[PDB]
């Protein structure tokens, strides 16, 4: 009964708009928004009928024809990276039919990119080392010797965000991340 884009990227540090379409909504039905974090169960955010709603979690904008609605997260952080389910349910029943929802990815804009590949020695071993490709801008795509995907961390108290990828083998980091285009200005100590 609801349609949503399966995946979406949004800017970090900005309000995020999440669209939903429910064309055949009845007068008795409400619009509900649920959020599901990885390895967690869905969690209620907000609901509305016709009026615009606002709580400490989000804002819900329903059109006057009630055919579509928008979930607005006030300030998108890395913790807002989850699946968002827009559902519609008749006022008397409780059963919820979930669609595919929206995989929201909160992406920061790296103001000062510093791409570099570092070698990290094991805390307790010899011939045990990983490669760390880090501080590359959000436009860099890393291609999978084991290479992990891009990961965004947030040093919250430092107002700092960084991207990284890890590579290891049982080999030299200099040639570890060469399959995808790594900035030519990458520091290789």
């Amino acid at each position: 009964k609801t349609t949503q884009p399966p995946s979406m990227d949004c800017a970090e540090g900005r309000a995020a708009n999440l669209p939903c379409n429910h064309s055949t909504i009845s007068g008795n039905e409400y619009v509900y928004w649920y959020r599901q974090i990885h390895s967690q169960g869905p969690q209620y955010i907000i609901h509305g009928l016709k009026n615009n709603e606002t709580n400490e979690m989000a804002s819900l904008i329903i059109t006057e024809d009630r055919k579509s609605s928008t979930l607005i997260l006030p300030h998108a952080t890395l913790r807002d990276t989850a699946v968002y389910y827009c559902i519609v349910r008749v006022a008397y029943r409780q059963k919820v039919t979930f669609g595919t929802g929206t995989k929201l990815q909160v992406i920061p804009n790296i103001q000062n990119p510093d791409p570099a590949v570092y070698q990290l020695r094991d805390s307790k071993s010899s011939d045990k080392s990983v490669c760390l490709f880090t501080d590359f801008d959000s436009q860099t795509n890393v291609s999978q010797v084991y290479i992990t995907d891009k990961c965004v961390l947030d040093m919250r108290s430092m107002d700092f965000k960084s991207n990284s990828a890890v590579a290891w083998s049982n080999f030299a980091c200099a040639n570890a991340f060469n399959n995808s285009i790594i900035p030519e200005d990458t520091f290789f100590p």
Binding site: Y30, Y32, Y34, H38, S39, Q40, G41, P42, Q43, Y44, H47, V83, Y85, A91, Y92, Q94, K95, V96, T97, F98, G99, T100, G101, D114, A116, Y118, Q119, L120, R121, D122, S123, K124, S125, K128, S129, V130, L132, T134, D135, Q144, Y146, T148, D149, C151, V152, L153, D154, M155, R156, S157, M158, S162, S164, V166, W168, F187, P189
Partner: protein, 248 residues
Amino acid sequence: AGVSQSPRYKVAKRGQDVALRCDPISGHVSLFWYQQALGQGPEFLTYFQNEAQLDKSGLPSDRFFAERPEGSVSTLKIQRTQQEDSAVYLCASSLARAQGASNTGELFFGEGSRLTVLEDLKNVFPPEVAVFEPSEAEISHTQKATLVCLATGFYPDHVELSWWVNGKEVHSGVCTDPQPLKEQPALNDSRYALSSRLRVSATFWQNPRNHFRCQVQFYGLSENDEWTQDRAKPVTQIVSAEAWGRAD
């Protein structure tokens, strides 16, 4: 004060019976069961209003059976378990229609019960955990210190990775891979590898009294599962890797 689901993770041999328990919020009359597969939304299974199972239109087959005998605690039983039953079984509870002031009419969910059906339990393995100390070049180039944790050779994908600084869990400056890597992608039921980072200030890492620990909570076999291999039973356990701060 929430919905509890047990066990969090369940490893089942193909053909054996499984039972998944749900503890809804006290006083809630509605109980729901959902089945959720990888990259898919929760699919309705069954509904309970107190002890009466009013809707079971979502139950996949005859092997699926649910109970809520006293209108509270519910059990979802899956007989002669098949590989296609491998999913996250979610339980939800709510408190009727317009019962009480400011009743949002929301569904309260448990954290789910992940079931993984395997042909052979000989493939169940706990992870090996290693911590990789921040690079000296990283500290002098950025004044930041990234600790890398590697969880390797675990099967199935029943892990929880977390960082611990001086006995307290840290979430800031942490990024764990949203999904693991297959160590042998040309093999079925291949073991996994998972990475995570903990980025702290170089000053914080250079303190040798600061304790760092990467914890990997693994979910394997229970006590009832029989183990006849010559290696240690791959039971539900925590595997850690520790490191002190390093001055320079």
